[PDB]
Ligand binder design. Structure first.
Ligand code: CW4
Ligand code: CW4
Ligand code: CW4
Ligand code: K
Ligand code: K
Ligand code: K
Lengths: 157, 159, 159, 159, 157, 157
């Protein structure tokens, strides 16, 4: 049983770590798939984001971090995944996640989207929010893996 | 080896509910469709009727076990050695209640993980409540129900 | 030639409801304000009282016909040769229920099209429920009701 | 000099409610925790029980006065010379009802300003309703309640 | 009775066709009005979008496709329309549609906004979503008129 | 008792005037704090926005208009404020305001976020909406202070 947790992870946060850890307690192999998402003008390069996530997830034995620029449905097929994992935060993410999952269902009917709910600790953060706080030299230590907080400060210097 | 519970009132089970258990059977080894007595909700069908309707409507699914329960849902999942809790996600108003509910279940049973599945567009606007409402007012609900459930619902409304 | 039905409980009719039918009379040739008995809701006013209050409060509108009905709303719209179904949109929680409702009505009567009108900012936060709640607790609701309806509501609460 | 009222059913008071009054005591000179009888809601605890539980659970707060009231909330705030109306904001479904409610209170008492405080993440998914539901079904609710309230809730459910 | 269905239509989708078809069963003349919307950086030019929509709607006798860069209220007056049609998809579109309709009511009180609900088939697609799927060479045949799908592939080649 | 009403105010609207006026009836001193927000590409410069807001609020004795580019929590501390005021319009603003307030609570626990509700009159406008209407030469007289409407037309000429 193979599941994919896709996202921009720009950068990966403790909310993302929360979700991927719950996915490893539930599925045999989880692929943390980092979308290139160049339309989003990500702060970190795909190679940067893959490196940050690999280091931030190394203590989790059954997580494989991979970058990709493909269509999600094609990449899920090529990875032999039948489960797509997405974290559910708020009502505005939810409605977009539904359009997404229905689109992914259209493109790959046997690829099933499942939504996990993060801990309350991370229920109000996002990559975007942490980055804006860090641009104003605010403390984001609590929201990020050490390697990621270390790298985020270096990139904003 | 992964044991998943899909709990609910199933008053009666609908094609949306069938959609959800069928997707859950494709992900987990054993799925327990747990029918809560929910005496608080004053159900149209008895718990045995709901179990019977749910059993025959899921009978073609090899790894579904239809079971009733009157315990607190977390207390039942613990006793069933279930680690996955299945919930179907319809609209945003379901979402907000599901979130409170899942945080409560996590407090009560941290090792029980709540999982949200998404129904087909076909069933994304029906509920047991609405279907019953339409049938109480002589509206056609055949499209939303298993055949065995449509006959029990028709038979129940004649009297 | 276009026949539109605006159904609801109207328990009692409010200035928000008047806002909606008045905008509907500017778009369609004949508007049927259909008062559902909604015995399920245990209404404060009787169906004849609601019809009477609604008739006089809409009497200045030439193409409004106030009618009661106890059928399923789609069954009534079919028999009235109505092809437009008017619903007033208040807030997002109305929206989610209106969407399920309209998909149900489309299943039951495809040729009946559901249309959503938007009330004035003035009435975008009132409902029959809230107005009644405030008046049961001796609050001023004069601003939200037609004069004839405010007197029936005052008279109904004295006893 | 600023007098603030925090009204509600408090059936029973929870740690979310304590969170809100405690933040309100840090902003306003005197906070009135107003316990509405809400006979409409068929409360689990009597009004005197709710006042007593709320008094001891807030007793460490110097500028909190726990008071019961059966008037319309605006009528009570007027008589208490309160100009700030405290409401706790949980999720989006609370928001939509709070907005209608606050516009109503502004109509009834323009000089009473509604203020929305945000609870801790800890209590952002609990309510009196859900806690009671879990405890009626033999679930652990110790984490969500003041100690004095957990004993009254345990004692109330034994019989 | 004259109604306007305005939008960016970048490009027009089967959801848009759904809504405009329902409007023609309800009103005598419907003007599918394509807003230039240069703030949105549309993928297709206004002339491209007007051509695509004209061809995609030709089988509907009482639809007139027009482009415009005016203020909506002025354009509705100049077209002798008293009805503004908008399709309602999700909760996040809804709140914006309300600010819009109230603004349009302020500018032209007799111009009434009416909201139609698309079929479940199109309740989870958008121009944006289809375009992103097509950028990754995903099948969007089901969501578009043939001429529009044909043109969307050519523009992404 | 010192409260801060922060925002982009690009430009300040009658909804903003509504909220700040309610804050002055409730707190002793209100600081209308204008965030530089260069990520938003504001139409008016920070100096322009501060000038517009000062003039638009001059009749309110206990409002001090200030611009800032700092972290909100640091600026609130430096102004000796313990109250952060935000206006609540719709469900989509609400969820973002929660992530914000929880972030600000993390950074400054004693800085309490409080939400005021504007009048129905301004419950459907935004700086963004007014600006788009003014770009199409639409009447925005009703939504803005005179000095701000006067300046908005000049900037769009
Ligand atoms: C980012 C996560 C994701 C999950 N599902 C799809 N996505 C993306 C997406 C968005 C919208 C349309 C298509 C796609 C797509 O096919 O791939 C993407 C990975 C780029
Ligand atoms: C795109 C559809 C639409 C429907 N109603 C208005 N719009 C647009 C708009 C958005 C926001 C403010 C003003 C306007 C406006 O006046 O015209 C636009 C056509 C550009
Ligand atoms: C604009 C109002 C505001 C209120 N609270 C914070 N903000 C902004 C913000 C957004 C997101 C992350 C950090 C911040 C921040 O620290 O300062 C900003 C002023 C730039
Ligand atoms: K998340
Ligand atoms: K649409
Ligand atoms: K505002």
């Amino acid at each position: 049983k193979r599941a994919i947790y896709p996202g921009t992870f720009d950068p990966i946060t403790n909310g993302h770590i929360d979700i991927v850890t719950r996915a490893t307690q539930m599925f045999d192999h989880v692929i943390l798939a980092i979308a290139a998402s160049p339309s989003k003008k990500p702060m970190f390069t795909l190679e940067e984001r893959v490196a940050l996530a690999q280091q931030a997830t190394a203590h989790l034995g059954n997580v494989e971090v991979v970058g990709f620029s493909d269509l999600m449905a094609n990449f899920a097929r090529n990875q032999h995944a039948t489960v797509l994992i997405r974290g559910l935060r708020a009502v505005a993410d939810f409605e977009y996640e539904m359009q997404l999952a229905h689109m992914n269902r259209h493109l790959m009917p046997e690829l099933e989207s499942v939504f996990l709910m993060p801990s309350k600790e991370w229920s109000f953060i996002s990559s975007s929010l942490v980055k804006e706080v860090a641009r104003h030299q605010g403390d984001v230590t609590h929201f990020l893996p050490e390697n990621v907080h270390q790298a985020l400060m270096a990139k904003l210097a």
